[PDB]
Every structure is written in structure tokens, then in C-alpha cells.
Symmetry: C2
Subunit: 583 residues, 2 copies
């Protein structure tokens, strides 16, 4: 088979082991409208090998400025001046450039989102007067004797408040007053992050050149959607049994680490069932591979990373019934419940260490797997000199791309943008944590492209393309979810109601507006026949254990901010996208 495939390979070099060099040349600059442009036009000559190297008759077809960009841009000692994006036009082109001008805007776009991120902390820390939510809940005279009900069935205490302080003394920097001033700003921010990037990418476009087979692709997927939902809870059933810093702070760190392992394990299966379902029927041509992964493989990650953070945010503390009745999981066990702090703090750590545990892993995986940095420097000293002439000889130990270019390093930032927007009600410093990360990620992704990897073919790509109907398809799901976090996951809207409708002399007993005395006034008692975090009629009502006015009031404040903070921020989506200067 050595000579059987040899006669095929020699036929292709006619129409122009020791590695081959390449170099007529002007005659293929007209059929399509600098060394990167030199490596561009030879790939237009080379266009194909899609099936030759994948068969194995060839091994690696490959290309082969550098010095200055190790100093002002890719050095760890690179002081913050400009991020010269214009060089990445001449160095790496506009596949990689449209991601490295994405970040550098995104980094400066996360600047003002972090000063409004420091804003919920700056007067969150400098004040010392909380209304109730760190005053009553931590003075153990007004939030000490609040004897609650258990949640689980067996191995469960009776429970008591004043075990909730260390979570709910630092919850009023994620609940108290800046949270509706930055999550009203974050829905404004993503609807300004998009539309100012549209003004930016057009400016970037002006600076630069210009039913049966898909059924079982989705109907087999929903068995794997619920595989992600059952990923978090069974290893929720593990760690909370073997345990009971210490109360729930270290455990909320710990339990979301354990699922984050299984998140990265089921990540590998998603790399091996996307190919199992696309190789069967309708493989197609070159541009529907990436448009399959955009609609299946990111969508795999969207159910891996986010359909357990949709489990803490949307369907965790629902269906508490008549004897604290769960649904029984249409089986023989008991279903879970939530805690009277707002369920967010057990989301804001799962928000943290799925985000700031991916940015401390998926960059440091791209640091330690390339042999850790500064062996002796890579080739800077002859980068000015360019006379390293067995340099073609010194290759083929270096690592190539795995026929997907930015896609893996681009999905991991859309997952990050899917956490700095879709889940931001809590934790305003998720910009500042992403700020210093996008200080470093714009250095180490600059570092590995400049030094570590084989030089990519400078494929001119115009606009993000396929992830653009996701960045709209996140931002229209985010302003729902930023609303559904302050509605269904945060306890501010019940804190606005009591401040505006339950401390007025109708249904309340105070003269003017004050937030004094909130936690005993906002839950529902459950007889021995204790309070639990729901709003139902107390036992011994006309219609007991069905809802109050006050469930139905704050659900009609909840459904209102899902309506008003949609229709305002959906209209600032209409007003800013009508009234900005294009140039």
C-alpha cells in the first residue's frame, strides 16, 4: 500500500522524510480579491487536501512581526498602553483578530461594568447601617428565634435561624440596594455591549477588508438534557450526606467542585456524540460542519454548564405542597427544597466556580500542558535575525489545531459571556473577576498563539458569524433571566413589596416607609400537623396551604418586572438601536 498511495500523491505535485517547501505567484492574486498574505495565496493555490491528509497519504500540510509582538503585546512585562490590534491584522489576520479585538473591547467594556460592579460593594462596604437583612438576621434576638422546618426527610434537624448569618451578613452586598442598580444596568449593559460592538465591528469592518434525521438529533438529546439535571443532584446526594468556612461556605465551594468534575467529564462525551450523530446522515460540505456544532455542540455545553445553573435558578425551590409536599419525583423518594436567604448564594458560588474555575483551569490547562513557560525563551533572539534556516527541519514536534480553529477557544468565552450576563443579579464583581482574567487571557491566548502553536492559516473571516445568533439568542434569554433571577431567584422583589405594601397601615403596622422587621413577616408557618420558604395560607385558614394575597401580590410583582424590565429594556434595545451615531 506504500506504492499504492505513492502514485496518487505524485500526480498532485505535477500541476505546480524531507519536508517540502513552497513558493505564477501574481497570477492567483486576481482570482481572489506580507508573509501572512503570502501564506494566504499559496493556500489558494493549495485549494483540495480535505481528504488526502485525512486519509493518511500526507501527514501535515502547513505554513511557516514575530519579534516586536513578543514585547509590547505578549510579554508578561507589557505595560498597559494600547493593545495594538492593527498588528494582528498583519500578524495573524482576521479569524484570530476578530477574537482579539473582541476581547480588547470586551475588557474595556467590562471596565465600566466593574465600576458599577464596585458600586454594589463601594457603598456596600463603606456603610454600616443595614436595614434588616443583616441587622435582624444577625442580631440573634430578632433573627435568632426563627425556628424553621426541615427540608429533607431523614438525617435532618428541626433547624433554627442564626445559623444563617455568615451567608446572610455578606448577602446584603449581593441583595441590598446596588443589585437593582447594576442588574438594571447589566440588561442595559448587554444591550449596550451588543449595539456598541455592532458600531465597533462595523468600525472594525471599515478598518479591515470587508424532519426525521433532525428529530432523533433532538429527541435523543432530551434524554441527555435530563442527564445534566441528574448530574448535579446525585453528587448533591453524595456530599451533603458525608458532611452533615465550615457551616455551608466551604460546602458550597465543595459541592460545586464535585459537579464541576462531572461537568468536564460529560464534556468529553459531548465531543464524542456530536460526531456520532453527524457522521450518520447528511455529512455535507465544508461550512455546515461548524453550523452543526453551533447548533449541537455549543448546545451540548449550554445544557452541560447551564442546565444545572438553570436548576438552582428556575426549578429548585418549587412545588412545596400541603404537608410540605414535594412531587415525590413520580417515584418513591422525596424531592428537595431551598433555604430562606433567597436561593442565589448557592447559585452565586456555582456562578463563581463554574466561571472563575474555568478561567483558572482552561487557561492554566493551556499553560501547563505546553510545558510550563520560559524554558529559555522560544526564538526571540533570531526573530530579528530570521536566519534559523533549519527551522522547517525543527518543526513537526509542535502541536497543530484539531481542524477546529478558534471554536474551542471561542466557545469557552461565550460560556464566560453567558455567565457575565445571563446570571448576573448577584455578584457584581463578575466583571472585575473577568476584568483581570481578560487582562491575563488576552496575554496567555496571545502568548500561545505567538509562541506555542503552529501558525494558523490566516483564514479571512468577516464577522463572528455563527455565534452571532447565539449572542442575540443569549441576550434575549438574558433579559428574561436577569429578570427571572430577581423574580424567581433573589429576594429583593419581596423586599420591595414589604417596603412598599406591607409596612403601610394596610396589611402592616408602621407609620412611614421603613424596612424594619422583615423575616418574621414574610414566610408561612406550617403546623406540627415552623416556617418554610414559601407563601401559603397558614394552617387554620379559610383555604389553608394554598397561596396568600402576598404570594399572588409578589408573583404579580414578579411577573411585572418580567414584563416591565423586559418592555423597558426591550425598548432601550429599540431606542439605542435607533438613536446612536453610526460613524
Amino acid at each position: 500500500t506504500n506504492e499504492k498511495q505513492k502514485r496518487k500523491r505524485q500526480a498532485y505535485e505535477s500541476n505546480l522524510l524531507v519536508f517540502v517547501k513552497v513558493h505564477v505567484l501574481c497570477t492567483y492574486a486576481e482570482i481572489m480579491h506580507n508573509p501572512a498574505t503570502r501564506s494566504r495565496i499559496v493556500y489558494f493555490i493549495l485549494s483540495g487536501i480535505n481528504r488526502l491528509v485525512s486519509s493518511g497519504i500526507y501527514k501535515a500540510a502547513f505554513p511557516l512581526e514575530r519579534y516586536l509582538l513578543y514585547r509590547e503585546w505578549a510579554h508578561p512585562r507589557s505595560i498597559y498602553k494600547k493593545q495594538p490590534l492593527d498588528l494582528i491584522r498583519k500578524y495573524y489576520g482576521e479569524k484570530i483578530g476578530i477574537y482579539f479585538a473582541w476581547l480588547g473591547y470586551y475588557t474595556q467594556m467590562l471596565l465600566l461594568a466593574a465600576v458599577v460592579g464596585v458600586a454594589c460593594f463601594l457603598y456596600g462596604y463603606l456603610d454600616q447601617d443595614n436595614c434588616t437583612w443583616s441587622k435582624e438576621v444577625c442580631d440573634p434576638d430578632i433573627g435568632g428565634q426563627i425556628l424553621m422546618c426541615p427540608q429533607c426527610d431523614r438525617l435532618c434537624p428541626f433547624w433554627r435561624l442564626n445559623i444563617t448569618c455568615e451567608s446572610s451578613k455578606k448577602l446584603c452586598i449581593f441583595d441590598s440596594f446596588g443589585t437593582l442598580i447594576f442588574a438594571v444596568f447589566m440588561g442595559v449593559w448587554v444591550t449596550l455591549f451588543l449595539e456598541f460592538w455592532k458600531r465597533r465591528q462595523a468600525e472594525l469592518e471599515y478598518e479591515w477588508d470587508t424532519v426525521t434525521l433532525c428529530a432523533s438529533a433532538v429527541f435523543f438529546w432530551i434524554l441527555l438534557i435530563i442527564a445534566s439535571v441528574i448530574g448535579i443532584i446525585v453528587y448533591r446526594l453524595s456530599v451533603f450526606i458525608v458532611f452533615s468556612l465550615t457551616p455551608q461556605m466551604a460546602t458550597s465551594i465543595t459541592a460545586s467542585i464535585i459537579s464541576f468534575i462531572i461537568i468536564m467529564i460529560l464534556n468529553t462525551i459531548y465531543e464524542k456524540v456530536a460526531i456520532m450523530i453527524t457522521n450518520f446522515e447528511l455529512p455535507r460540505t465544508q461550512t455546515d460542519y461548524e453550523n452543526s456544532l453551533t447548533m449541537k455542540m455549543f448546545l451540548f455545553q449550554f445544557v452541560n454548564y447551564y442546565s444545572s445553573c438553570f436548576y438552582i435558578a428556575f426549578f429548585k425551590g418549587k412545588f412545596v405542597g400541603y404537608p410540605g409536599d414535594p412531587v415525590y419525583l413520580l417515584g418513591k423518594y422525596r424531592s428537595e427544597e431551598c433555604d430562606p436567604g433567597g436561593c442565589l448564594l448557592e447559585l452565586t458560588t456555582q456562578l463563581t466556580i463554574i466561571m472563575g474555575g474555568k478561567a483558572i483551569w482552561n487557561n492554566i490547562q493551556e499553560v501547563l500542558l505546553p510545558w510550563v513557560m520560559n524554558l529559555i525563551g522560544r526564538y526571540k533572539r533570531v526573530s530579528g535575525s530570521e536566519k534559523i534556516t533549519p527551522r522547517w527541519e525543527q518543526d513537526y514536534h509542535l502541536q497543530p489545531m484539531g481542524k477546529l480553529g478558534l471554536f474551542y477557544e471561542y466557545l469557552e468565552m461565550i460560556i464566560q459571556f453567558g455567565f457575565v450576563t445571563l446570571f448576573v443579579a448577584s455578584f457584581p464583581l463578575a466583571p472585575l473577576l473577568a476584568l483581570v482574567n481578560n487582562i491575563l487571557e488576552i496575554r496567555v491566548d496571545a502568548w500561545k498563539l505567538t509562541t506555542q502553536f503552529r501558525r494558523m492559516v490566516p483564514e479571512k473571516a468577516q464577522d463572528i458569524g455563527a455565534w452571532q445568533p447565539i449572542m442575540q439568542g443569549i441576550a434575549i434569554l438574558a433579559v428574561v433571566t436577569n429578570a427571572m433571577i430577581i423574580a424567581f431567584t433573589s429576594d429583593m422583589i419581596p423586599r420591595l413589596v414589604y417596603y412598599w405594601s406591607f409596612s403601610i397601615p394596610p396589611y402592616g403596622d408602621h407609620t412611614y416607609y421603613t424596612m424594619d422587621g422583615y423575616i418574621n413577616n414574610t414566610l408561612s408557618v406550617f403546623n406540627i400537623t415552623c416556617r418554610y420558604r414559601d407563601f401559603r395560607n397558614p394552617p387554620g385558614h379559610p383555604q389553608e396551604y394554598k397561596h396568600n394575597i402576598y404570594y399572588w401580590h409578589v408573583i404579580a410583582a414578579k411577573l411585572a418586572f418580567i414584563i416591565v424590565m423586559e418592555h423597558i429594556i426591550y425598548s432601550v434595545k429599540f431606542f439605542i438601536s435607533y438613536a446612536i451615531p453610526d460613524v
Copy 2:
């Protein structure tokens, strides 16, 4: 000045009273990419006169097939076969053609919207078993003794039910069961009317060729927004004083006639203040005139026709307070209220005779003002012969366009599409009334173009253009308003609640689901200190005259269908616009 302007006019004929003919000719077919095409290219030669004829040095520059299109398409005896749109390409082009293929689709698009329009009547009429809403309300033993409160202050009775039958026997064909089956279909219909027209117009595109000055433009406008709101009520104050078929049927006909006069009078002022505010600052070039009228002049009509139908639908029966307290109109009078039938029937006639009183006026104004039809036929007999050679001599008594082409005849249909969609919860036959109207309007607008008017310059226009961000900007406001009619204006959502939550043994006294006994169970009593149509706590409550569970429940069903029937029909906007065949 006769010879002063004569020397200007003779200079322009150099570079080529008795009317002039026109006719080198191939040499201007290349600079831009059949008699209509003959009149096209000479206007490209003629391009300009924008300032010459408007000054007065000329009188009318003008152009000058016909026979066959009076027979199969424009005849009253034109049997329904095809509507040959392809002829309007060769006869009138694609300014007028993109409106006459708009209608012919729209007419067939209103076919299925009228069989689902007959659907709320077909089993609305063939059944004779109403649950309650025409049984209790018209058996005068269960809806006879329902003694209500007055609404106004002086010259007002105590009032009683069983005066509401003739409105509420024929209200269960606009409320009972088909209304959530066609208004769920109408939000589906407009989000299928758009997206199938997008597939149609592309098919039509394949068949055919291819801060200070605007501040006081809007801040003076809001004084005229409330001028429209005060247009309806003062002549509401007139007619209801001089009165009291006869009970309220003839009056709901009458009062909406009187405002419809003032609607057409304030229509004339809007034609004379659009020019008053655009001639002052930044007049501009030729294509921002129509984009001024799209954003001011239609917007004038959108407040003329619709900000009194937004007064019956959104802010008519709100702010009923503690002694039935209105707001007092921050003045010294008393503000109004609504009636316990759902406020829709006093909207569905204002829906009718602003729609079916514009389609019986604005077409019949274009019939009787051109001298009523068939004087003797116009020029059909020589249309085959074409030898009427003083035909240029016989013109200049005929009427021209007033420098706006389709715009007036195109605004009046967008106003119609703004009633067959934005206001459709009630009255399913608003397709069938618009069906036989769009049988006739596609004949008489075909008739006046073919016979009555001077032939328009066949200006090739590609897509509707400026009214396309209105047809999206209606359909995103319609699925709000179709929701806000069943929420804020119709009494079905309170009829689903009692059927599902107030006839169950919690808060109700019946075994299984039945709608028996609804009107005494759904209003709130008001002491002499009678029921009124609101849901407040009865006098002698813990917190009296503030709301019930049941206000807050049905407002949380109201805000839910504003949320769910948005997010479903806003996602069928995402699913049909992802999964239809383009070709």
C-alpha cells in the same frame, strides 16, 4: 416675470399652450441597470424638475395592456380566477405592484383567518347551551337581581342587571370559547402573515428585478397626543347627556360615529402640522421626506385612530378607588368607569366603525369624488385600437398624484392591518369584513388606477421599505395588545380562573369543573357608606377596598398570559422563522 422665467425654461430644452411630446434612447439604458419601461427611461433622461414645476415655470410634466386589464381584473364582472399580478409588472410596475400583490396575498391570507373567524361563530351559533354568560345574565332570576352601583356623579340611576342582555347575549360569540382559539391563532397569524410574506416577497423579489430640533418635534407632540385622548371623551360628554337598538346598541353606533367625524377633522390638521415642523429645520434630500412621514405622519394617525382605542382598551376602567374613587382628573370633576360585561363590546364597535367605516368611506370617497362610475365607459373601445391621437390634447383635466404616491392609499391599509391584528380578541369576522372589502378594494383601487388617475411614473421600488419597521413594530406591539386585550379588556381570563380556581372546593362550592354561577361570584360589593366592576375587599374586611386574593390571582393570570402567550408566540416567531422552507 413672463419673459424672466421664459429664458430659464428654454435653456433646459437645449440639451435634449401646446403640450410637449417626448421620445440616444438606447444610450441611457446602460447608465441604469415596453411602454412602462419606455416611460421609465425618459424619466431617467428627465432627471431635475423638483424645483421647476414647484416654482411654477412649468405646470405638469407627465407620462402617457390597458384593454385586457379592464376585463379580467378591473371589471365588476371579473370572476375570481387568478388576479394576474404579472400584468401589473408590465402595466404599472412595482411601486404599485408591491401593493397589489400585497393585497392579493393579504386577501387569501385573510381567507384562513376568516374560517377561524367563522369558527367563533359557527359553533357560536349552532350550539344552544351557554354556560353562564348568556344563561345567568339573561335568565332574569340569576342575573336579574344584580343591583349595581352608578358610574357617573349626576343624572345617574342606581342601576340594575337584566338591562345588559342585548349586549351580553351576543357577547358569548365574542367572549365564550373561540376567542382564545382565534386570538391565539391571530398572534400566530400575524407571526405567520409576516414570515410567509417574507417568503412571498422574496418569491416576489425572485419573480421581479431585485437632539434639539427633534426634541420639540416630540415634546410638542405629547400635547397633541393628549389632544386625541380628549377628542373622544368630550364628545362622550355630549352624546351620553342628550340621550340618557335603543339601550346602548344604537348609542355605541352613534357615539363612535361622532368621534369618527372629529377623527377625520384632526386628520386634516395632521396634514398641516407635519409640513409646519419639517419646513423649519433640516428639510434635506429626496428620501428623508418619506422617512419623516413614516416617523411623524403615520405616527400622527397612530395617535389619531388608536390613542382613543387605546383609551377603551388600556386606560378606561382603571383607578376606581375607595368611595368608588376616581382620580378626579387632578381637577374638580369626576372621572369615568366601565361596565360589567368586559369593556370590549364598547371597543368592538369602535373597532368596527373605525375600520368598517373607513372601508365604507375611504373607498367610497374614491368612488363618488371621481364622478360616479360608468359615465359611458372610459376609453376601452379604442384601447384595442390606440388611435385617439388628440389624447395628449384631452388631458390636463385629469387628477394627478399630490407628490406622494401610494403613501395615502398605503397608510389607510396599514391602519386596517393595525385593526385586523392589534385589536383582535373580539370580533373574529374582522377578517371576513376585511375579506369582502379586500375583494372590493382590490377592484376599486384597481379601477381608479386603470381608469381614473393620470398614469403614475413606474418607480421601481424593491420592498415595502419604510412601513416594514412598522409592520414589525405593530406585530411586536400586537402580541402585547392581543394579550393585553384578553388580559386588561376581555373577561375570559377571569372566566378561566373561576372555572379552574374558584369552583374547586378551595374558595368554591362545587364538585367538578363547571362554569355555573359566575357574575354574583366575581365582582366586589360597595356599601352605602352594590357591586362595581373591580376586585377589592368588601367594606368590613381586615383591609377593606384594597384588593383581594382574586384581583391579585387574576392579575397574576393576566400578567402570566402577557408573559406566556408572549414567550410562546414570541418563540413561534423564533421557530417558524427558523424552520420553514425558503424555496
